[PDB]
């Protein structure tokens, strides 16, 4: 996260860290959507152009963490993965269309002051909140500049109009993505960056004061460049797949 700030304790209790098991290396962000289901980006798991095809035993998650500097007794929890489900129409060949994956935890995680699931959007919430100029929030332990922080970073960023997203880049965008960030004209800055993929773009509902995950950090071109914007997988658009996987397993 570029131009963010340190998260407050418990500010993002749905935050999940995706690690390589051996050697332990932080790979990506992720988000907690129930006691045993975690959402991330597909490319953190599967990316043939880089010979990447991680299986369940290659990985682990940590949940309820605030700092990488110290072990947080009785607060942070580790879980192994039972199964990985990648979207079956994830397009790694072209533009990362449907960059989304679900991971089922071997052991359900106990909820706590630091561990708690985010909501997935219903239709009305999606239509109401996912509009240009509305701000969401992005969190991650990924790069601070186009190295990595000791405390979780957070940045608030406005959704951008689809024509502007589309004209900002030559990569073919789809309706399964959206973009966010400040325009040069607006003064403020900030972006997700390499290492933040899989982390959530969340929005707080004014109707019921619940936090909803609208996007998943997916891709960009540099970080925090003028006239460029981060791209997120559009969660709502893919929610029938999410529900089928969770309901059908």
């Amino acid at each position: 996260i570029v131009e963010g700030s340190d998260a407050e304790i418990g500010m993002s209790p749905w935050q999940v860290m995706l690690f390589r098991k051996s050697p332990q290396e932080l790979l990506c962000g992720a988000s907690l959507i129930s006691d045993r289901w975690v959402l991330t980006a597909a490319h953190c798991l599967l990316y043939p152009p880089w010979d990447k095809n991680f299986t369940e035993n290659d990985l682990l998650v940590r949940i309820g963490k605030h700092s990488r500097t110290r072990y947080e007794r009785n607060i942070e929890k580790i879980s192994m993965l039972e199964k990985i489900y990648i979207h079956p129409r994830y397009n790694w060949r072209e533009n990362l269309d449907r960059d989304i994956a679900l991971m089922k935890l071997k052991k359900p995680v106990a909820f706590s002051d630091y561990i708690h699931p985010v909501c997935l959007p219903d239709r009305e919430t999606a239509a109401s909140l996912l509009q240009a100029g509305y701000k969401g929030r992005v969190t991650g332990w990924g790069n601070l500049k186009e190295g990595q922080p000791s405390v979780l970073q957070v940045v608030n960023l406005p959704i951008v109009e689809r024509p502007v997203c589309k004209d900002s880049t030559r990569i073919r965008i789809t309706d399964n993505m959206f973009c966010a960030g400040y325009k040069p004209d607006e003064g403020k800055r900030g972006d997700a960056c390499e290492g933040d993929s899989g982390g959530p773009f969340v929005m707080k509902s004014p109707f019921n004061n619940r936090w909803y995950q609208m996007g998943i950090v997916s891709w960009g071109e540099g970080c925090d460049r003028d006239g460029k914007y981060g791209f997120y997988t559009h969660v709502f658009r893919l929610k029938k797949w999410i529900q089928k996987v969770i309901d059908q397993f």
Binding site: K135, N156, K204, W211
Partner: peptide, 26 residues
């Protein structure tokens, strides 16, 4: 259950920047 944080919404406390988000709805 979902999307209500034990240390914030569940205790009627605001985080340091959430007002920026809610203001953006106006």
């Amino acid at each position: 259950d979902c999307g209500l944080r034990p240390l914030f919404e569940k205790k009627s406390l605001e985080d340091k920047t959430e007002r920026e988000l809610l203001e953006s709805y106006i």
